[PDB]
Design a protein around this ligand. Sequence first.
Ligand SMILES: CSC[C@H]1O[C@@H](n2cnc3c(N)ncnc32)[C@H](O)[C@@H]1O
Ligand SMILES: CSC[C@H]1O[C@@H](n2cnc3c(N)ncnc32)[C@H](O)[C@@H]1O
Ligand code: NA
Ligand code: NA
Lengths: 232, 221
Amino acid sequence: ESAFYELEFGPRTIMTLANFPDDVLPLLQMESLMTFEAMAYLRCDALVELGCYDGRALEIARLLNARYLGVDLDQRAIETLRTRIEREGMSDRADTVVDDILNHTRRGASVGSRALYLLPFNLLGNFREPKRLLDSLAERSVAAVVSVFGDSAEATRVRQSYYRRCGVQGLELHTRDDGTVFTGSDGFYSRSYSRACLHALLAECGLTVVRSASNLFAHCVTVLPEGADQGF
Amino acid sequence: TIMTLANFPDDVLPLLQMESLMTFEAMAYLRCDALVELGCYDGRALEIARLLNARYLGVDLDQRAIETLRTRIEREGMSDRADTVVDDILNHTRRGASVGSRALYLLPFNLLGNFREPKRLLDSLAERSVAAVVSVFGDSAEATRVRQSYYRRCGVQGLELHTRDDGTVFTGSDGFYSRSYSRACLHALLAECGLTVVRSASNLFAHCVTVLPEGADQGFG
Ligand SMILES: CSC[C@H]1O[C@@H](n2cnc3c(N)ncnc32)[C@H](O)[C@@H]1O
Ligand SMILES: CSC[C@H]1O[C@@H](n2cnc3c(N)ncnc32)[C@H](O)[C@@H]1O
Ligand code: NA
Ligand code: NA
């Protein structure tokens, strides 16, 4: 799992904004708005961004005066995030770890009292076995936001352009009933989801849907782990 | 050709994210039934209107970006609630038809800074808006570095950097102009144009403010 993101320039090629088709921005905006609103309503004092790169959700924590933890394998992107945290005077409230996401979710200390876990920008679709990641959220979180590419013809055309712009080698497209799977010879793996398939996967992993939003490109879901306390 | 993501350094994103969150929260709290995005490109605030079930009007002179937006509105089933106009921003604020009873006007991604006479635009907001969100580049060393890289990727000819106490000005031999703002200068300009700051946020790259036109009604619709 995540072999592609252990490559020196794996994360850089995928997360460089200049490599994004314009139509990626609506996916990122929907996910941002839903994370912001979820943290307020569910009284989360902490945001944990899995695959944060250079801190793509830091502004959400900033405008809510929430604690922030960014987790990524990419040392260079985390150093950019550390530099911004210091310059923003957020060192007391915002932290970073260079580590595997599953190392963090399985063994990492709690962040704040009521943490929301963000799985942004199709992170879940980059796991061949997404149930291992989803199952690990229960321990340290009272909520999660999961953002994935959808399976519309338009979404697939965006992804065809995006992954080639990123320079993914030997890119192949595999069409399935419930999503489109892209693979690369470099260990690249990215699937999209139908709304029904995403909802079914979440229910299977004991994650209750409280909010579900879709646009032409993406599905974004706010979930509560069953067994999570829902106090204030 | 300044709006395609292909031309954006990574450090542009925190500016876009801060103004999106402040526009979203302003629409909800101030009970705005319409979002009017000035310089909307391909509908960079459409998702805010969509997720609040608000009316939307995108104003831009980029007819390609507007046609992209019109198709997105149709495919999202938003035709009855979202529209576009290929118009000059000041012509729209001066003479354009009103949208909803409580419209919020968004001035995104340093639109105010890309105007040489910003007072004309700000003064025009008085009549037709109950609220506005204004997003500008700041004057940090990091903001100036990001802007230089951005304008270079946009292919501005004879790009020159002019240092000032209240914001860095970039010019080109092609007639390109864009200024950043200190927090103090932005607040002073808005006050001068009868716009009261109700929310003010800054990050390393940007200032974003929510304003009410003084004399604008503040009911619930
Ligand atoms: C938003 S999905 C892509 C981002 O997530 C990061 N990422 C992907 N898989 C992992 C993983 N297993 N552990 C940590 N970061 C990861 C990548 O380095 C990139 O910044
Ligand atoms: C965010 S500022 C840049 C955006 O605003 C648009 N724009 C700039 N000046 C004007 C103008 N005077 N009238 C309408 N749109 C404009 C550009 O086409 C671009 O999409
Ligand atoms: Na995800
Ligand atoms: Na959309």
